[PDB]
Amino acid sequence: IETVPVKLKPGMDGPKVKQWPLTEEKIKALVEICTEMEKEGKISKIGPENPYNTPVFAIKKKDSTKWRKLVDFRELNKRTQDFWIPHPAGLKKKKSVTVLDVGDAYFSVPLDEDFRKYTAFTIPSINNETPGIRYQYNVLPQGWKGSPAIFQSSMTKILEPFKKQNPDIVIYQYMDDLYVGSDLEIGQHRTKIEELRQHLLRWELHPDKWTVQPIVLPEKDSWTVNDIQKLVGKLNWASQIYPGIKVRQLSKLLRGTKALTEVIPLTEEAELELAENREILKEPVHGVYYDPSKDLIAEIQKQGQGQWTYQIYQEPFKNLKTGKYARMRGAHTNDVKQLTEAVQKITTESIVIWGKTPKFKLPIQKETWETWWTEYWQATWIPEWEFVNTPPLVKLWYQ
């Protein structure tokens, strides 16, 4: 129960981040939450000699109608001193993985008395009527990068019995979440998860088939001019990813100022060039590797009718992962709820595959996203993001 020494990175002051407006019911939710946290010693009120601040807001996780408190520790985490476990490659290869919340555990551990002034947050008031309630954490705070790293020793001891019992069950931790995988493919894995639940009390995702989904070309008996023009455009784009793609024989079909709806029969040379390009796109991309020293980039496109495509990469045209998300979730009428859920699924997949989160390029104006994304967010972490304001011509190609 001995506080461990923690300091900021050299040359970096604590976070000074503006709190943004909250609705009345989210303020009332946080007032109830933070009052009780004071009685339990988790947090304590502070004064104006603390110039530091980190934003805080409220969410409702699924399967519950109770508000939860989320702190945006992004600025603190980047300014927090780097803490001295290789990512488990088996977790991405495991048939099924289950995610658990271990955040409550962090509250048992005290936080170094010197570092607490950096965990300061503010419950805001409506209309600037009364000054905001200012708190600081006395225990390890959820969402902080130092909380999993400091608790790693205790967690290793807590799960050392379960690990010896089951050596085919993978265990990984990111932020306040625990990722438990298995090749069991058993509904009893759900009960074995209950075994890991009670074992924790004492003290559903499955990988996609393809990491990168293949580029596919249409198979047709009759091609129009427009059909051949869209094909040549896609192949030319893929020629940036794949070496030997050739468009010469297909473009020769387009010769002449022909009407768009007119059917062109393919030559035997043109049929061959398309088959050779098919074979090129069946093989995987050449020399694509993940560097843990670089950032992951995630781009998302809205495809219409609740469908969304995405690609994860570090170097353009060298995709480490591509995929598509559709949903019947309660988001059909709201594009922003769909994107926010899409951003969450992609970041979770990213945690499983490399144990880090990507920087998103979102197909949305900043002011719309910033006004609404907290309304639909359900995860204890938050990634980084930027905004794409120019339509990508490539949207059709990923569909």
Q: Which residues bind other proteins (CB under 8 A)?
A: 16, 18, 21-24, 27, 47-51, 53, 126-131, 134, 224-226, 229-230, 232-233, 236, 247-248, 251-252, 254-262, 301-302, 304, 334-339, 362-365, 367-369, 371-372, 390-393, 395
Shortest Å, Cβ 48 to other proteins: 4
Gap between the Cα atoms of 399 and 397, Å rounded = 5
Question: 221 labelled as ligand-binding?
Answer: no
Parallel/antiparallel/unpaired status of strands 297-304 and 359-362: parallel
Q: What are phi and psi of 244, to 5 degrees?
A: -85, 10
H-type alpha helices, the chain: 24-39, 74-79, 89-93, 103-106, 146-165, 188-202, 225-241, 248-253, 268-282, 335-354, 366-372, 395-398
Confirm if 52 and 14 have CB atoms less than 8 A apart: yes
Question: 177 labelled as ligand-binding?
Answer: yes
Gap between the Cα atoms of 172 and 90, Å rounded = 10
Sheet holding 177-182, edge to edge: 96-101, 177-182, 170-174
Shortest Å, Cβ 359 to other proteins: 18
Question: 104 labelled as ligand-binding?
Answer: no
Shortest Å, Cβ 165 to other proteins: 46
Q: Which is nearer to other proteins, 21 or 214 (CB)?
A: 21
Shortest Å, Cβ 24 to other proteins: 3
Q: Which is nearer to other proteins, 182 or 309 (CB)?
A: 309
Confirm if 360 and 296 have CB atoms less than 8 A apart: no
Q: Which is nearer to other proteins, 162 or 369 (CB)?
A: 369
Shortest Å, Cβ 290 to other proteins: 29
Q: Which is nearer to other proteins, 71 or 235 (CB)?
A: 235
Q: Which is nearer to other proteins, 207 or 306 (CB)?
A: 306
> Which pair of tokens denotes residue 92?
């991405």
Kindly give, in sequence order, each residue whose CB lies less than 8 Å from that of residue 371, ignoring residues fewer than 6 positions away: none
Confirm if 30 and 21 have CB atoms less than 8 A apart: no
Shortest Å, Cβ 66 to other proteins: 20
Q: Which is nearer to other proteins, 161 or 218 (CB)?
A: 218
> Which pair of tokens denotes residue 152?
């790693």
Numbered residues of the known binding site for Mg(2+): 101, 176-177
Numbered residues of the known binding site: 101, 176-177
